[PDB]
Amino acid sequence: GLDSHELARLHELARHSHAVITRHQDAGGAYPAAPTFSAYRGYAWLRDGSFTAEGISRYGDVASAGRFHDWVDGVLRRRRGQVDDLLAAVDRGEVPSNEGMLPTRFTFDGNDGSDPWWDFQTDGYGMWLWSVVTHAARHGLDLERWRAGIDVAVDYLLAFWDRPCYDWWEEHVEHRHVSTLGAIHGGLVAVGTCAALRSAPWSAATLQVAARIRSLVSAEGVVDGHLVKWLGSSAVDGSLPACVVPFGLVPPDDDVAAMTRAAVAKDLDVDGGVHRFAADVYYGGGQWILLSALLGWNLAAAGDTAGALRHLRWIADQADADGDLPEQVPHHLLHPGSRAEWVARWGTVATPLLWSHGMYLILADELGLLP
């Protein structure tokens, strides 16, 4: 589906994607979100990092991906006691406040980088479980290397999966977001179906809770045949295809998968560039590279190779002169009048965003296009 001109460019963007991610990986193994963006620099997210790590693992850099998993594992083992205390509080009928929960931002030395009152999220822990299991399977690795950190994440998610939290976008703490539920589900199914983990004390529980997540989504997270952004809403969010691939609420051929891809395309995809959600005013609500990649990945997995390629091409067209991929671009803005104030406050849009590169690597690999 690609000529020599396109292939050369796509190959080069893959090589550069690998290079930029590994150049900016912290000494301790964390992947930063964006080394030069004011509001993100100095911090790591499990969400960004897990997708970045999966792109790097697919690319074949076992060493780099492993160092990320090492970093996460060690950070989580350090929270063994915090998690045990949260669980003990629950058992005493004293449910912890959001202010006491595990963090969203991490410093590179594994401390809280932000206050969870303001950004409490559970998705990243689910993503990490998915990521580490997938990596180990791909490369034939012994999960015992990372198991104690897996155990912390599992225990935490089994307790807290059903709690309201902010979405991937740091919005709406009172709601239960389907792509958050989906991320947790993906992680739980990954560990619950992993033969190396068959004897873990939580083995059966992970699949039972995954089933509970699917029940909740069936009851409150599907409208008019499609997934919705949060339980009890009617609208879609551009994150929702992740619920299909990779997180597996439904398979790619399911009607709800098809309808969800179609709804996201219709409501949020403009010319190949996918918006986050209709009300998005962040930088005016631009078109997100990672979301176009996510949709493309989902299209590839459904057999729509042409649609996948169209989204891959759109992403490639957003690379700057150095090959760096921004977080988002303003070719179409949902709320154009809101962009200037973001630029004025926080600077120009995060570029490179490592997650953009990670997602590019995943989509490229899905289409057989890694060099």
List the domain boundaries for the chain.
1-371
The residue annotated as part of the active site, out of 170, 220, 267, 304, is 170
Sign of CA dihedral 229, 41, 293, 345: positive
Question: Do β-strands 226-227 and 328-329 pair in parallel, antiparallel, or remain unpaired?
Answer: unpaired
Exposure string for 311-334, b = 16+ CB within 10 A, e = fewer: bbbbbbebbeeebbbbbbbbeebb
- H-type helices in the chain, by residue range? 4-24, 46-59, 62-77, 80-91, 116-119, 123-139, 147-160, 178-192, 203-220, 255-268, 289-301, 305-316, 339-346, 354-366
- The residue assigned the tokens 């969800």 is 260
- Catalytic-residue membership of 327: yes
DSSP designation for 337: G
Residue 266, Cβ density class (10 Å: 0-12 exposed, 13-18 middle, ≥19 buried) = exposed
- Catalytic-residue membership of 54: no
DSSP designation for 360: H
- H-type helices in 95-146, by residue range? 116-119, 123-139
The residue annotated as part of the active site, out of 61, 73, 167, 171, is 167
Q: Which pairs with CB-CB distance under 8 Å and at least 24 residues apart come from 140-144? A: 141/66, 142/196, 143/194, 143/196, 143/197, 144/196
The residue annotated as part of the active site, out of 54, 171, 327, 366, is 327
Taking a C-beta distance cutoff of 8 angstroms, is the pair 84, 69 a contact?
Answer: no
**Pair of tokens at residue 77:** 């083992």
Rounded to whole angstroms, the Cα distance separating 350 from 44 reads 14
Please tell me whether 342 is known to bind a ligand. no
Taking a C-beta distance cutoff of 8 angstroms, is the pair 58, 138 a contact?
Answer: yes
Nearest Cα to Cα of residue 320 among 17, 6, 1? 17
SS3 17: helix
- Mutual orientation of helices 354-366 and 4-24 as an angle, nearest 10°? 140
Taking a C-beta distance cutoff of 8 angstroms, is the pair 75, 28 a contact?
Answer: no
**Sequence letter at residue 364:** A
End-to-end alpha carbon distance in the chain: 16
Nearest Cα to Cα of residue 84 among 96, 73, 74, 72? 96
- H-type helices in 193-244, by residue range? 203-220
- The strand pairing partners of 223, in sequence order, are 226
Query: What experiment produced this structure?
Result: X-ray
**What's the full length of the chain, in residues?**
371
Taking a C-beta distance cutoff of 8 angstroms, is the pair 368, 66 a contact?
Answer: no
Nearest Cα to Cα of residue 299 among 289, 291, 309? 309
Rounded to whole angstroms, the Cα distance separating 173 from 165 reads 4
Element (H, E) at 223: strand 222-223
Neighbours of 335 (CB within 10 A): 15
